[PDB]
Amino acid sequence: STNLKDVLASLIPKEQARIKTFRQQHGNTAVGQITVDMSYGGMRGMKGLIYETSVLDPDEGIRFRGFSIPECQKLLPKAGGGEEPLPEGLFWLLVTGQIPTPEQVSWVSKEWAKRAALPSHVVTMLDNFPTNLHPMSQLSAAITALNSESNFARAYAEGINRTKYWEFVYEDAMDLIAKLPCVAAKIYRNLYRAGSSIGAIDSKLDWSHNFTNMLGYTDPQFTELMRLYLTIHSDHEGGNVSAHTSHLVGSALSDPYLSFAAAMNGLAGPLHGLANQEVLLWLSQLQKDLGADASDEKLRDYIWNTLNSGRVVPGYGHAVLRKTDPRYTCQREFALKHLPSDPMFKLVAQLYKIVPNVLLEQGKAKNPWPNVDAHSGVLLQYYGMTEMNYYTVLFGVSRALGVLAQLIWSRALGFPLERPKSMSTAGLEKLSAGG
Amino acid sequence: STNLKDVLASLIPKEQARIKTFRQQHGNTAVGQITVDMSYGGMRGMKGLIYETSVLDPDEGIRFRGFSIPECQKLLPKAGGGEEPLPEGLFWLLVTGQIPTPEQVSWVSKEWAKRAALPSHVVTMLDNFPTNLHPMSQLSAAITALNSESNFARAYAEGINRTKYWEFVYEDAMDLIAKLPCVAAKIYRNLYRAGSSIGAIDSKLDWSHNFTNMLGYTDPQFTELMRLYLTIHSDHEGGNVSAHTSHLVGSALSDPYLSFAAAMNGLAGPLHGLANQEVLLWLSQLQKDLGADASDEKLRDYIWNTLNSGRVVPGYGHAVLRKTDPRYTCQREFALKHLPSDPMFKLVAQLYKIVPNVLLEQGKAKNPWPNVDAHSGVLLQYYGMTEMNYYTVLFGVSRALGVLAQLIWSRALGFPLERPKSMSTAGLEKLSAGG
Ligand SMILES: CC(C)(COP(=O)(O)OP(=O)(O)OC[C@H]1O[C@@H](n2cnc3c(N)ncnc32)[C@H](O)[C@@H]1OP(=O)(O)O)[C@@H](O)C(=O)NCCC(=O)NCCCC(=O)NO
Numbered sequence: 001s002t003n004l005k006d007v008l009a010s011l012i013p014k015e016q017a018r019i020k021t022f023r024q025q026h027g028n029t030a031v032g033q034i035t036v037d038m039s040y041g042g043m044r045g046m047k048g049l050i051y052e053t054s055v056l057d058p059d060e061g062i063r064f065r066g067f068s069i070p071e072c073q074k075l076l077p078k079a080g081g082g083e084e085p086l087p088e089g090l091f092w093l094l095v096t097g098q099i100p101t102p103e104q105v106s107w108v109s110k111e112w113a114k115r116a117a118l119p120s121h122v123v124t125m126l127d128n129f130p131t132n133l134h135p136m137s138q139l140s141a142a143i144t145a146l147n148s149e150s151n152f153a154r155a156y157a158e159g160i161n162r163t164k165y166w167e168f169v170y171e172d173a174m175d176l177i178a179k180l181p182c183v184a185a186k187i188y189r190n191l192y193r194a195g196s197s198i199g200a201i202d203s204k205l206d207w208s209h210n211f212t213n214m215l216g217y218t219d220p221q222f223t224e225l226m227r228l229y230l231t232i233h234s235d236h237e238g239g240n241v242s243a244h245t246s247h248l249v250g251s252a253l254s255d256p257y258l259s260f261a262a263a264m265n266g267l268a269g270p271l272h273g274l275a276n277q278e279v280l281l282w283l284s285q286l287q288k289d290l291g292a293d294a295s296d297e298k299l300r301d302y303i304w305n306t307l308n309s310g311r312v313v314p315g316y317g318h319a320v321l322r323k324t325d326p327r328y329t330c331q332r333e334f335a336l337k338h339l340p341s342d343p344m345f346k347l348v349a350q351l352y353k354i355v356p357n358v359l360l361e362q363g364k365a366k367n368p369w370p371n372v373d374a375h376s377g378v379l380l381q382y383y384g385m386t387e388m389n390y391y392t393v394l395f396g397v398s399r400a401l402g403v404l405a406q407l408i409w410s411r412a413l414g415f416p417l418e419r420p421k422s423m424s425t426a427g428l429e430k431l432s433a434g435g
Numbered sequence: 436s437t438n439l440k441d442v443l444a445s446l447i448p449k450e451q452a453r454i455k456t457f458r459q460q461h462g463n464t465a466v467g468q469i470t471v472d473m474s475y476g477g478m479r480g481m482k483g484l485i486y487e488t489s490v491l492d493p494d495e496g497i498r499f500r501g502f503s504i505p506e507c508q509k510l511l512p513k514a515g516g517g518e519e520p521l522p523e524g525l526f527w528l529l530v531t532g533q534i535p536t537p538e539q540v541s542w543v544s545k546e547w548a549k550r551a552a553l554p555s556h557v558v559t560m561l562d563n564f565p566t567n568l569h570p571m572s573q574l575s576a577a578i579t580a581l582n583s584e585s586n587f588a589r590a591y592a593e594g595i596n597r598t599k600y601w602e603f604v605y606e607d608a609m610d611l612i613a614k615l616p617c618v619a620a621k622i623y624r625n626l627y628r629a630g631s632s633i634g635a636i637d638s639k640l641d642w643s644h645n646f647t648n649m650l651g652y653t654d655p656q657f658t659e660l661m662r663l664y665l666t667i668h669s670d671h672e673g674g675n676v677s678a679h680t681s682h683l684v685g686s687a688l689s690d691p692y693l694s695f696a697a698a699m700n701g702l703a704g705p706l707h708g709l710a711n712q713e714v715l716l717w718l719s720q721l722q723k724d725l726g727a728d729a730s731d732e733k734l735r736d737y738i739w740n741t742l743n744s745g746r747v748v749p750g751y752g753h754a755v756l757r758k759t760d761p762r763y764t765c766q767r768e769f770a771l772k773h774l775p776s777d778p779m780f781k782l783v784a785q786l787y788k789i790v791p792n793v794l795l796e797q798g799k800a801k802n803p804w805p806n807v808d809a810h811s812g813v814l815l816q817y818y819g820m821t822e823m824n825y826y827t828v829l830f831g832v833s834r835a836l837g838v839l840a841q842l843i844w845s846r847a848l849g850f851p852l853e854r855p856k857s858m859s860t861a862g863l864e865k866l867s868a869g870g
């Protein structure tokens with residue numbers, strides 16, 4: 001009775017019409033200007049893409065189809081006896097724009113359970129990878145290697161009319177989200193629990209729960225952390241590196257597997273999702289240098305040394321946000337409720353009182369406040385997931401939700417190839433006069 | 436005596452200063468406006484990035500550091516007894532902006548020969564891949580898997596000061612360009628010449644020549660075709676999908692291996708580099724449907740059927756070009772000189788007289804003229820390289836030259852994270868009033 005595909009079939013034509021008319025009336029309306037500094041500055045401040053699933057406000061933070069994090073916490077269906085929102089429900093919301101029922105949520109969970117399966121070539125590849133090959137690299141290679149199963153790639157090769165692209169994107173998206181946790185978990189076990197198996201999917205559990213089981217964790221609170229983690233990391237508008245990458249790549253009609261893998265290559269950057277890992281490594285050196293309970297003056301010192309060495313302080317700053325990331329706050333609230341006395345948590349809390357001030361003092365960062373990455377690893381470590389080089393994988397798994405939801409829409413709406421004009425410094429100087 | 440690294444060490448600081456001053460004077464100067472239609476239209480017509488290596492003119496085609504194709508043909512050093520420009524020389528030009536000497540060119544060739552080597556994990560992976568896994572997917576997975584050797588990734592993890600990034604990018608770039616042909620050729624042999632070996636690199640030959648040897652081709656004209664192919668496919672300004680992808684991904688400080696692999700995922704799109712493959716498959720069905728020597732009326736018919744079925748005609752049209760791609764012309768001239776009587780060539784020639792007109796008649800395409808992809812496979816087929824699903828790999832190998840040359844510069848110049856602002860249809864409607 002529940003079928004997302006049928007819901008979308010109704011939704012698509014209305015949005016098409018709506019955008020059509022809008023463009024009819026405002027296509028030539030200017031929404032902004034481009035300056036030399038924006039071009040040199042990684043398009044900072046440039047309104048450049050249409051991305052429907054979520055929109056980030058510089059002061060208020062992210063909204064998912066118009067809802068804030070607290071709103072989601074409050075509205076989305078939870079697990080039986082749970083407190084944290086099920087990522088399945090978030091997916092529904094991103095895709096349809098509507099809050100799902102628990103019934104709808106359970107369908108998503110079954111669907112994902114049904115579609116979870118890995119081809120042998122992929123298993124073989126993962127099992128043959130060296131342990132010194134970073135987890136994100138293993139993840140991206142595996143997803144790329146899965147493209148042999150692409151239903152979209154297959155339909156395209158058959159000559160499908162462009163109007164049906166969305167339908168095949170939808171299938172691969174659902175298939176890929178379903179397989180993610182199996183891939184991710186196989187990496188975890190191969191690297192850190194050599195000789196054991198991820199086991200099988202329980203068609204009766206939610207996606208997060210099957211995932212934690214494959215990871216080998218039994219604590220129920222951990223399952224709850226996972227559900228939250230996976231929900232809040234899902235999407236962050238379209239201009240962030242990973243999302244933009246999926247967008248750009250999909251625009252050329254590469255299948256979702258290839259688009260998602262390219263995205264992961266972007267998430268793996270130190271200035272992007274790798275920060276979650278970098279924060280923990282930074283904290284480890286800290287505690288190692290100074291030792292467990294540091295004084296504020298010592299913390300300051302340590303921060304300055306980093307800045308003075310031509311490095312960034314991981315987990316702080318943002319290209320768009322101008323205040324503390326609500327994702328950070330949300331994590332803080334979780335810690336406060338569950339592991340208030342953890343020394344690492346306490347360290348993280350202490351830095352919140354210090355880092356921003358030093359950054360302010362330094363005068364370079366536009367946003368001296370923390371971002372999501374400053375608070376995620378600390379939670380993970382508490383539950384026994386101490387493998388910091390693996391943290392980004394979790395982020396990657398989450399992010400699939402947002403980017404794949406948009407991807408369906410991009411093709412439904414007929415968005416064309418992303419192809420802006422570039423310029424050379426010399427050409428630009430000429431364009432103006434030069435300086 | 437020749438050392439590109441030392442040359443760049445001198446060049447870098449001057450460019451820095453120059454850009455510094457320019458921005459001082461013109462940073463706030465507006466170079467353009469953004470309209471609703473540009474945002475909905477994949478940034479078409481938006482001046483959005485700085486990319487130094489090459490600049491595309493909509494009428495005149497591509498210029499590499501200010502030189503046109505014919506100019507390069509004429510200025511770049513050739514092989515002994517050769518006619519086509521050595522890609523090594525093109526690389527030098529992109530990187531330094533100066534035409535290299537033959538001596539300089541030979542150094543590049545030695546350097547690339549010296550650095551060529553594959554780690555076992557990568558060889559193992561390639562050898563275990565299934566034959567139904569597309570060549571581009573095999574290629575991207577392999578490059579990603581090579582990141583275990585990244586010198587940049589390693590330095591970053593060591594805390595290197597940001598000012599030295601370029602130095603490590605340069606090393607990985609040279610290493611990666613050197614390994615490309617080994618990877619690419621191993622794929623070719625595994626898929627199409629099962630049981631044979633690529634053999635070893637001859638430190639005495641140019642890069643193209645070692646590549647053709649590993650591919651197993653003996654014809655000297657083929658070596659010449661390769662040199663040309665690899666040179667002309669090298670770069671095409673910064674806003675094309677593959678380049679933009681490398682740019683975006685590298686901007687987050689992902690290493691060159693990861694940035695290049697993501698790019699390949701974009702090149703593999705049917706609207707991008709996969710077109711070279713698609714053109715040949717389209718021609719094969721053509722010849723199959725109609726049979727070898729078709730009438731113009733039949734060709735028209737066949738074209739219309741494609742268009743009427745909601746598909747594109749591969750190899751025609753362009754996001755920026757508005758006239759026939761000089762890369763196409765350059766290939767035509769090659770064919771005319773070497774395989775003037777080939778029936779497929781002749782077919783390709785015939786379509787040039789017909790396709791544009793049909794496209795014009797249809798009234799949708801902005802540019803009814805052919806692009807590079809319409810003429811490349813035909814040349815390859817003539818020499819016995821009939822594996823059309825492999826053609827994009829060649830493109831990928833070439834493209835490494837341009838994107839990696841820019842990548843060094845992006846980090847030298849300190850370009851920040853690419854992170855534009857996105858918008859939702861609803862948010863945008865509000866911003867204006869809505870339509
Ligand atoms: C998130 C970043 C990349 C935003 O970049 P951008 O929009 O260019 O920041 P900005 O405009 O404030 O930069 C202005 C200057 O302050 C510096 N600065 C910014 N944040 C800084 C930080 N955390 N530490 C040190 N210096 C910093 C910038 O590097 C830049 O210096 P230069 O002018 O000398 O280049 C930046 O804040 C940063 O590097 N932060 C640390 C890395 C991090 O935490 N990344 C994860 C972010 C969230 C995410 O994507 N999660 O997945």
Ligand SMILES: CC(C)(COP(=O)(O)OP(=O)(O)OC[C@H]1O[C@@H](n2cnc3c(N)ncnc32)[C@H](O)[C@@H]1OP(=O)(O)O)[C@@H](O)C(=O)NCCC(=O)NCCCC(=O)NO
Pocket residue numbers: 414416417479675705706707708709710742746747748749750751752753754755799800801802806807808
């Ligand atoms: C190269 C492309 C993607 C440029 O896209 P874009 O800048 O959006 O083209 P455009 O503005 O002319 O598009 C206007 C309309 O004409 C259509 N059109 C454009 N080229 C077309 C073609 N070759 N066949 C059929 N329809 C075409 C577009 O799809 C679009 O239709 P809708 O409005 O219904 O969406 C386009 O010309 C195309 O699809 N060409 C065929 C594929 C191809 O040859 N790709 C390789 C290009 C070069 C390259 O990257 N090599 O690596």
Ligand SMILES: O=C([O-])CC(=O)C(=O)O
Pocket residue numbers: 235236239240241242319320371372854
């Ligand atoms: O929004 C950004 O640019 C980066 C970020 O926090 C995310 O992708 O989660």
Ligand SMILES: O=C([O-])CC(=O)C(=O)O
Pocket residue numbers: 419670671674675676677754755806807
């Ligand atoms: O310029 C473009 O957009 C596509 C193209 O021809 C290339 O990348 O070679």
